[PDB]
Ligand binder design. Sequence first.
Ligand SMILES: COc1cc([C@@H]2c3cc4c(cc3[C@@H](O[C@@H]3O[C@@H]5CO[C@@H](C)O[C@H]5[C@H](O)[C@H]3O)[C@H]3COC(=O)[C@H]23)OCO4)cc(OC)c1O
Ligand SMILES: COc1cc([C@@H]2c3cc4c(cc3[C@@H](O[C@@H]3O[C@@H]5CO[C@@H](C)O[C@H]5[C@H](O)[C@H]3O)[C@H]3COC(=O)[C@H]23)OCO4)cc(OC)c1O
Ligand SMILES: [Mn+2]
Ligand SMILES: [Mn+2]
Ligand code: NA
Lengths: 187, 188, 480, 481
Amino acid sequence: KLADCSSKSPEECEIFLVEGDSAGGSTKSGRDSRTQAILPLRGKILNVEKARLDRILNNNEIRQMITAFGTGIGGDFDLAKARYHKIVIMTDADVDGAHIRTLLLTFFYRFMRPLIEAGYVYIAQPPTGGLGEMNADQLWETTMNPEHRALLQVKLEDAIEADQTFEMLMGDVVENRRQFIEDNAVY
Amino acid sequence: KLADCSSKSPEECEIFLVEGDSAGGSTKSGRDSRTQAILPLRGKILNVEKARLDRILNNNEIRQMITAFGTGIGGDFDLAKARYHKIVIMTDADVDGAHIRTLLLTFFYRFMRPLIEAGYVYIAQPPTGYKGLGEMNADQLWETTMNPEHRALLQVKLEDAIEADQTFEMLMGDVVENRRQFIEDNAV
Amino acid sequence: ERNITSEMRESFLDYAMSVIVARALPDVRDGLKPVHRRILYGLNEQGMTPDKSYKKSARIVGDVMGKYHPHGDSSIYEAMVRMAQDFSYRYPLVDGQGNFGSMDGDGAAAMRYTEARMTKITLELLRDINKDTIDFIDNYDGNEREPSVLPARFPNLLANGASGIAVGMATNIPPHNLTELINGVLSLSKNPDISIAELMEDIEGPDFPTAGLILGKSGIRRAYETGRGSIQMRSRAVIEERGGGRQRIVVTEIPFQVNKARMIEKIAELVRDKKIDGITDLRDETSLRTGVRVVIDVRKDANASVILNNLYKQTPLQTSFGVNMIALVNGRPKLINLKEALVHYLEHQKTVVRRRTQYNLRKAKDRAHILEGLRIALDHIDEIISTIRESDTDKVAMESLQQRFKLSEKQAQAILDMRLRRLTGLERDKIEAEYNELLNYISELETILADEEVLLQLVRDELTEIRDRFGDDRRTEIQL
Amino acid sequence: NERNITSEMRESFLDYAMSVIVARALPDVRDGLKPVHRRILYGLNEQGMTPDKSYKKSARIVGDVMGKYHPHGDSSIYEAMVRMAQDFSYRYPLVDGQGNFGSMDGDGAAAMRYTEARMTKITLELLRDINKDTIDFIDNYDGNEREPSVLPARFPNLLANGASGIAVGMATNIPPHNLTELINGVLSLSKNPDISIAELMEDIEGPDFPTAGLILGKSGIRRAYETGRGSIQMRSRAVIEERGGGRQRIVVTEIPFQVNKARMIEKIAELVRDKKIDGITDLRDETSLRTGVRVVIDVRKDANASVILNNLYKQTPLQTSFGVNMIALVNGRPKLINLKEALVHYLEHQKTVVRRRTQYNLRKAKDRAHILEGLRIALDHIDEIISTIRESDTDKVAMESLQQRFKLSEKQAQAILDMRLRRLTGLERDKIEAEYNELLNYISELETILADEEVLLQLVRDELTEIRDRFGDDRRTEIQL
DNA sequence: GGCCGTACGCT
DNA sequence: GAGCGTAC
DNA sequence: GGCCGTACGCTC
DNA sequence: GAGCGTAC
Ligand SMILES: COc1cc([C@@H]2c3cc4c(cc3[C@@H](O[C@@H]3O[C@@H]5CO[C@@H](C)O[C@H]5[C@H](O)[C@H]3O)[C@H]3COC(=O)[C@H]23)OCO4)cc(OC)c1O
Ligand SMILES: COc1cc([C@@H]2c3cc4c(cc3[C@@H](O[C@@H]3O[C@@H]5CO[C@@H](C)O[C@H]5[C@H](O)[C@H]3O)[C@H]3COC(=O)[C@H]23)OCO4)cc(OC)c1O
Ligand SMILES: [Mn+2]
Ligand SMILES: [Mn+2]
Ligand code: NA
C-alpha cells in the first residue's frame, strides 16, 4: 500500500513509484517524510494499450495509482484535484526497469494525458551500478534529495507522433513492433 | 484442502493425514484416486489437551478433520456416519513427525475415542532416514507406504482406558512439572 | 528534461532486444537460452557430474544466481525442473531426485525438497569446454567468467526443441530423434548442397518425448522448408470390442505440452454441458508400470468411432504444434529452415574440433619441449646434479643449467622441480615412452589442422560415437 | 502389526522432548551455542566468510548450512543468523550483516534474498584452533559431511551473549554479560578454584545488556548467581528535561532488553486513550541512527512529571523484569547452573582446548623433525643417495634400498624420493637446517606446557587476557543501588 | 511454505 | 494478561 | 515476494 | 480462446 507524506500542500509534495517492496521499504526510510510519498509497484504492471476499460478498472495496481493521485481518469480527470505536483518513476537501472517505465508512461498518456502536459510526470536517474540492492541513505542522496538529484521532466512535444508511437510499441499489432525492432537494432 | 477419493463406500475407502503440502502434493499424485483420500496438515497441530473447546472448534485444522471424517465429536459422535474405515497418520520419520503424531492421537483420544476402539486409526511406516516425506518422489511414496500389498500399517489399539487417560494428561497437559519428571526418568 | 516519444522508443528497444538476445530465444549452436546455459555451466563448475551424489536444488540455484544469473530464484529453479522432466525434454539435461512434477500439471516440490545433478548426455554439451573451444565472457558483475556458448557435441536445438516468448517475435521448435538428427548432420557433411527433402530421409519429422501420433508429412515439410508450419499431434487411442456389444476407448499416449488432468477435465466439461454424448464413464488409470492410460467407456447405442473423432476436434486429445523456428544466429534472431539449423550446428562442430586440435597441439608442443629438457638431464644426470650442488641460489642454478646444457628457462625450471624418484629405472623409461607417444600425437594433430577432410572426418567419427551411445528408437509415429 | 496407544504416546513424545532439549532449544555450557547457531558459524567458517572477505547473500549461506548440517526449514536458520547480526539482541554480535536486519520496533529483517552476511572479528575467536584437534568432530545428519560437537570458544560466549530457549519440560533464560568482567572472573577462578560467588561478583558486577539501560539493585543479581534463578529489574534511562518556564518533557534514551519499542509506545497511547494515566499532552518516537533511541513524552504545565514517569514504570514495559533460569547442556544433559558452575565448565573447556592444541602441534612438530632428519641424512650423503635411487628399477625397491642402507623409516625414504633437485642448492641446504633447529626449540616449548599443569594454566590465562585487551569494552547497563 | 498479480507472441 | 525464539 | 497457523515454558 | 515459459 501507499506510504503517504505528512504535508497536504500538493505544490511542495511529490510521489515516488518504486519498483518492488524491498526498494519501497528502503525508499520509505531514506525519504523526507514531510514532502515525499512512496507507492511500491509489485513487478510488471498491466499494459493499458492491450487491455479494455473493464480490465484496467478492475486491476489492483492501476486502482492504487488513481487513488494515490486522486485526479480521476479520462474525461473525469481534474488537475486541480492532484495530491502531488511531482509523480516520479523510480525503476531499476536494468532492462526490466525500462519496461515497467514504458508500461507506466502508457497508462499516464492514455488516462492522465494533462498530467504529462502540466509537467507533473518525472523520471528518476539512478546510476547503472538495481533498486532492490540500492543502499538506504545513498538512495536519498543520489535520486531523491532536491538539491543534487537529477530528474527528467517528461515533455509532450508532438501529440500526433506520440499517439502512433504507443500504438506501435504497446499495441495489439505485433507486426509493426517486429518491423521497428528489425529496423532500429536487428538490421 | 482435502483431496477426496472417487468411491463412496467407507469400508474400502481410506484417508491419509500427511505432514505438509509438498508431501501432500506427492501423496495425491502417487495414491489410488479410487480408494485413497489425502488431508495435508500445515505443520504442528493444536494441542487439544492445553486448549478450551472454543479454541478447538474455531481451529481451521481441527475443523477440516471433523468435516473429512463426517462423524462429529464428543457425545454427537457416530461411527455409522464415518466416511473412511482407515484413518492413516503419515508423518515424517523425524522427531517433529512423532510430535505431530502425538498431537493427532491427543485429538483422536479426547474427541473421537470410539474411532480408535473400532481400530480405524492407523500409523504409516515410511522409510527411515535423513530424508523427509516432502523430499520423496510420488511413485516411491506409493510403493513403500501406500500400496496395500507392500505397506506396513500399525493398528492403534486401546488396551487400558484408565492408564491412557493419565498418560495424555501427563504428556500433553498444562502442568509442566509431571512432564519434566517423565523426561528425567526416561532420558537416554 | 526528456521527450516522451524518445524515452518510449529508447527504453522499449533496450528491453525488447534484451529479451530477444539474452532471455527468451535459444542459440542455434547449443540450443540453449542464457538461463539453461548458466544452469549447465553451474552444474559443471560445481562438479555435479553423473558419478557424484545429488546436491540440494537451493544450493545449485544459489551458485548459478550468485555468479551468472542476476534474476529471481524461481526463474532458475523452474528452468532446471523442465530439464529434469522426461515428458518435457526428449533428452533430459538434469537428473533430479524427489518430486519434479508430472503430466497432470502439478509443479515440482520447492528447491529445499529437491536435489539434482547433470545427466550423462549433458557431459556431451560441456565436453572439451576447458580446451579453448568456445569464447568465454565476463559475467554481470565482472567478478566471474561464463561461456557465450557450450561446445554441444550433439545437435541440442533440434533434439530438445525450444519454446520462448520474446518481444515482437516468439519461438517454437519441436523436439527430434538424436539418431535421425546425427544422420542428417552426417549426410550434410558428405553433401553440402543437400535438399531438405533428402535430409527428410534421415529426419522423418519431430519426435516428442510423450510419443503420440503425427497426422501427415505435409505440415512437417512446410516447417522444414520455410521454418514455419502446423503439425497435427494426435493421441494414441484404440477402440476395443467388449461383451454385450459394448465398446471403450483407451488413450495410451497424449500430445506434447498437453496437461493430462486438464484434458480429462475438458471431456468431463462436455459431458456435463451435453456437448458430447455416448460416454458413460471417464477414468485415469495412469500408473508407473503401464504408463499413460485414459479409459473412456462408451454407451451400447452410441458409435465409439464417431465419439473418438468428435473428441479429437473438441478436446486437446488432438492439438497442433505451431512451428516457428527462430534461433539466435550470430547474436541476432532468424527464422531458419531444417538445413540452416543443421548447417550452423555443423559449422559450430568444425570450429569446436579445430580449436580443440589447436589447443591440444600447443600443450603437446609445450610438454615435448619440457620432456626434451628432462631427457637431456637424464642422459647427463651426474653433470646436472653437480651443476645444481655448486650453485648457491636457484637463480644461479637456472643460469648455469641453461648455459652449460643449452636449455631454455622453462626447461631448466622443470629440471630443478624434478623429484628424486624420477631417477628410478621405470621413471626414466616412462619419460621416454611419453615423449615418443607425444611426437606421434603432434603428427596426428598436425594432419587434422593441415587437411579440412581429415578434420571433417574426426567431426563425423565423434558424432557417430554420440549416435551409438545416446541414440534411441523413434517415439512419435508419423501417419500418412 | 499392532501398537499400544500408551506405549506409542510415551515413546514418540520422549523422542521429541529429548531432541528439543539436547539438539535444539538449549545452549552448550562450553561454547554457549544451540545446534543451529554452531552450524551457522561453522558454515560461515567452511565457506571462508571471514571479516576481511566481501559479504555473501544470506540465501547462499543458509543453503549451504541447510544442505550440509541443518536438515530443517530455511527460516529457522535465517532468523537465528539475523539475531546474531542484531546489535540490540547480541552484546557481542557473531554475524556482520549488510542490509535490513530489523530494528528494536519488532519489524523483522528483509527476506534472505535482500540481505548479505559474513562473520564478525569476535567470531574468529569462537572458531580459533578448530582444525588443531581441539574439539571432537561428529558425523552430520546424512553421514556425508563432518561437523563440530562444540566450538573451541576462546571467550566465555554463554554468559557474554546469553541464551533464551523454550524446550520441553524446561526453558532457559541467561542474560548477556560484559566480556572484560567475565574474563576477569575466569582469571580469578583460575588463581583460586575455591572462589566464592560474592568474590566472583567483584569482577562480574551483574548482567550487561546491549540495549544498555538500568538495573534496580544487586539483590536480584545475587540470587541469580547463587541459585541459577532470580528476578532482575530492568529500567529505562529517562530524564525529566526542564523545557522552558513551567513546561516539562520526559526523554527516554535507553529501553530494557528484549522489549519492543513500538509496542511500548502503543501501550502508553492505550493508557492515554483509556484515561488510565493523566498529564501527557504528546507522545513521539524521535529515534534515528545518528541520535540513537529517543522517546519524547510531553507533560502538561503545573502537572508533576516525576509522578507520571514512576506510574509509567509500574504500568508499561518501560520497566520490565528479566526472569533468570540458567539452564545449559552440561555433558550433553540439561542442568540449572550458578555463576561459578558456568565459569568452571568454561575454564575446564579452555584447559582441554589448549592441551589438545599443544598435543596436536607437538605431533606435527615431531613428524616434521623426523622428516627433516631424513633430509639432513640425504644432504650429507647426496652422491650415495642418488646412486641408490638410480640403481633401483622401481620406487618400491628405491624405498627398501634407502631404508636399509641409510637406516631410514618408510616416511623418511618417501620424503627423500619426493625431494626436488632445487633442494640441493646452497641456500636450500641451510634452510632445511635452520627449520630443524627452530623446530627442536618449538618441541621443547610444547613439552614444557604438557609436563607442567601451571605452565598450561598460565598459557590459558595469557590467551584470555589477549582477548580481554582486544575485544573488551565498557559496561553499558548501569546497576543502581 | 503455498497462494497468486502482470508482460510477451502465437494459434 | 502475552510474547520471547527455534521448529513444522 | 508479503501474508500467516501451530508447539513449547516462563513470568507478567 | 488460454496457456505455453522466463521475467518482475
Ligand atoms: C503453507 O504451506 C505450509 C506452511 C506451514 C507453516 C505455516 C502455516 C500457516 C501459516 C504460515 C506458516 C509458515 O509460518 C510462517 O513462517 C514465517 C517464516 O518467516 C518468519 C520470519 O516468520 C514466520 C512466521 O512467523 C510464520 O507464520 C510456515 C513456514 O514453514 C512452516 O512449516 C510454516 O499461516 C497459515 O498456516 C507448514 C506446512 O507444512 C509443513 C505447509 O505446507
Ligand atoms: C508480493 O510482493 C511482490 C510480488 C511480486 C510478484 C507477484 C505479484 C503478485 C503475486 C505473486 C507474485 C510472485 O509471482 C509468483 O512467483 C511464483 C514463484 O514460485 C513459482 C512456483 O510460482 C510463481 C508464480 O507463478 C508467480 O505468480 C512474485 C515473485 O516475484 C515477482 O516479481 C512476483 O500474487 C499477487 O500479485 C513482485 C514484487 O515486486 C517485484 C513484489 O514486491
Ligand atoms: Mn531489477
Ligand atoms: Mn521433517
Ligand atoms: Na482439438
